[PDB]
Design a protein around this ligand. Structure first.
Ligand SMILES: O=C(Nc1cncc2cnccc12)[C@@H]1CCOc2ccc(Cl)cc21
Ligand SMILES: O=C(Nc1cncc2cnccc12)[C@@H]1CCOc2ccc(Cl)cc21
Lengths: 304, 304
C-alpha cells in the first residue's frame, strides 16, 4: 500500500548523458549509439536567441566546434546535422551503455520521468505530465537544456521529450527526439502563449481508483452520472471532456475495485462542486492529474 | 524555475540490487563489495512472522540455502551472519558496480530517495521523508522488502534505509544498514503503535522559501513573530517546535530571499490559523514538509 509520484529508475538514461559545448554555450546531450542529440540552440549566444537564423548560425560551425564530453572523456565529432530543433552529432564511438531504446511522441495527458541534468551530469529525477496545452511543469535551471523525458518498458527506454525552453510564465517547453516541439512553441526568446490548460480527467479518475485501492474511500457516494451530465460539470471546471476511450482505459481499475466508471465520475462531480472540505485524498488537498490509468495499474501491481 | 519532489538519480543504486531467496521467501538484497545486505525476515515463512525466533530460524539455514541472483547470474554464498535485523551474506565476488558508499543513520525529518524493487529489479524511484515518528509514507507492495533509501553527494551514495515492514496503518517501517530499526518497530506481524507524528516545521519553512524563489508570494504578509509565539501556534497545530538550530539551517534561504526567518514564521502562522483559502503554493493545497532546507538549496542552485 501507499501511493507515490514515482519516476522510472534513471540508470539506463544516466549512461547516455553527455555535455555539449559550442562556443560559450554548454547544455546536455543524449548519446545513443554513435549519435549525440541536443537542442539546436547550443549554437546560439544569448543575443542570438532573440531572433536566430539557425541554418545560418550552424553554417558558421564545424564538427570541431562541438565539444562533446562523456564523464571525463572527449568524443570525436565526425558529422553534424540539424533535424527540426535538434542537432545530431555523429561521434566516432558508439555509447557502450546504450540501452534498448525507441523515440516516441507522447500524447497530451501522458506521463513521463525527467532526468534533470547540468553539464552532462544528472542531478535528479521526477515524474511529470505533458499538460493538455503541451507544456510541462518541470524543475529546470539554466544549463538544464538537453535534459530528457522517458518511459521504460522492461529493458526498452522510450525517449519522448527533450527540454529546450522556459516560458516567461515559468512553464517548460520542449521537443520529441526528432526535434519537433510539443505545442506551438518556437526556440526563440520571444513572447509565447502556452494556451488554456485543462485538468486531465481520465488521470484524476485513475488517481481516485488508486485512492480506493489504498484505503481513502471517504469521497465515495450513493450517486452515479452519465457521460453527458459529467461532461457539463467537466466543462464548468476546465476538465478535459471524458470520452468512451477514457472509460475503456479505466476498465481494469473499475474491475479491480468493483466501482463502475460513471459511479466514480459521480464522485469526481461531487468533489468538483463541493471541494475537499479540508480533507485529503492520498495525502493531497487537490485532485491529482499526473497519474495515468496505466501508471496506477503499474504502481498497484508492481511492474519492474 | 519550477519546484518538484525530486529524487536522486538511481543508477548507482540499481547496480547493487539483487534478488535474495531463502526457502520460499524472496525479497531484495543490496550488493556492495562481497556482501549482500537484506532483511533477516527472508528466513521466515508467513507463519514464522507471528512470533519468530530469528537466532533459531537462522540456525536451520546454511550458506547454500540463500539464493542470491544478480540480474541473471547466481552469486556463491560463502558466509552468513545476522546483524540486528539484517542478514549479511558474504559472496565470493565483489560487485563490479559498487559505487563509493557510506552507511548512515538519518535523523527524523531528513529526506531520502527510495528505489522500490521487486525480485531484485528496480520498478521506480521516489523522494520521501523519515517522519518525526520514524515511519515513512512510501509505496511498497509484497516483495518490496530489502528496497533501500539513500542520498547522493557527488559520487558517494549514503545508504540510510532498508524497507522491512508495512504496519496495519499503511505506513512503512525499516532499518538503517546495520539492521537497527528506525522507531520502536520490531520485525514481527504484531500490533505496533507508530506514535503521534508531527509536521516537520523547518521543512515547511524551507518549502515556503522555495515558493518565494519560484514566484508564489501571495502568502507573504506585513507581520513578524518570535520563536516562542510561533511555537505556541506550532503546538496547537502539531508542528515540531522550531529551535535556533532550525533558524540557522534556514540562513542561506533567508539570505537569498531577504525575508527574515521569523518573518517567514509569521507567514506560516497565518497559513496555519487561516488555511490556504482555496489557493495553492507550488501546486499544492497543503503545507509541504518533505523538502529539507538542504534540498531546496540543492534544487534551486542545481547541484549535480
Ligand atoms: O529557455 C532557455 N533557458 C532555460 C531553460 N530551462 C530553464 C531555465 C531556467 N532558468 C534560466 C534559463 C532556462 C534558453 C535561454 C533563454 O532563451 C531561450 C529561448 C528559447 C529557447 Cl528554445 C531556449 C532559451
Ligand atoms: O511487512 C511485510 N510485508 C510487506 C512490506 N511492505 C509492503 C507490503 C505490502 N503488501 C504486503 C506486504 C508488504 C512482511 C510480511 C508481513 O509480516 C511482516 C511483519 C514484520 C515484518 Cl519486519 C515484515 C513483514
Amino acid at each position: 500500500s501507499g501511493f507515490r509520484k514515482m519516476a522510472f529508475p534513471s540508470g539506463k538514461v544516466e549512461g547516455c548523458m553527455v555535455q555539449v559545448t559550442c562556443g560559450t554555450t554548454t547544455l546536455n546531450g543524449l548519446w545513443l549509439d554513435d549519435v549525440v542529440y541536443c537542442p539546436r540552440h547550443v549554437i546560439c549566444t544569448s543575443e542570438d536567441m532573440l531572433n536566430p537564423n539557425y541554418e545560418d548560425l550552424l553554417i558558421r560551425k564545424s564538427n570541431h566546434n562541438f565539444l562533446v564530453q562523456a564523464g571525463n572523456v572527449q568524443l570525436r565529432v565526425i558529422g553534424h546535422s540539424m533535424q527540426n530543433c535538434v542537432l545530431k552529432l555523429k561521434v566516432d564511438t558508439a555509447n557502450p551503455k546504450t540501452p534498448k531504446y525507441k523515440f516516441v511522441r507522447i500524447q497530451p495527458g501522458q506521463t513521463f520521468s525527467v532526468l534533470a541534468c547540468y553539464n552532462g551530469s544528472p542531478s535528479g529525477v521526477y515524474q511529470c505530465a505533458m499538460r493538455p496545452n503541451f507544456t510541462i511543469k518541470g524543475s529546470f535551471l539554466n544549463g538544464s537544456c538537453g535534459s530528457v523525458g522517458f518511459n521504460i518498458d522492461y529493458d526498452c527506454v522510450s525517449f519522448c521529450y527533450m527540454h529546450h525552453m522556459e516560458l516567461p510564465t515559468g512553464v517548460h517547453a520542449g521537443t520529441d527526439l526528432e526535434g519537433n516541439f510539443y505545442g506551438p512553441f518556437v526556440d526563440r526568446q520571444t513572447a509565447q502563449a502556452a494556451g488554456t490548460d485543462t485538468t486531465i480527467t481520465v488521470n484524476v479518475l485513475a488517481w481516485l481508483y488508486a485512492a480506493v485501492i489504498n484505503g481513502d474511500r471517504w469521497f465515495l457516494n450513493r450517486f452515479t452520472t452519465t457521460l453527458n451530465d459529467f461532461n457539463l460539470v467537466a466543462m464548468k471546471y476546465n476538465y478535459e471532456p471524458l470520452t468512451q476511450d477514457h472509460v475503456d482505459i479505466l476498465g481494469p481499475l473499475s474491475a479491480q475495485t468493483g466501482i463502475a466508471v460513471l459511479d466514480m465520475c459521480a464522485s469526481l462531480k461531487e468533489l468538483l462542486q463541493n471541494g475537499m472540505n479540508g480533507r485529503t485524498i492520498l495525502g493531497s488537498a487537490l485532485l491529482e492529474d499526473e497519474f495515468t490509468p496505466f501508471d496506477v495499474v503499474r504502481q498497484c501491481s508492481g511492474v519492474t
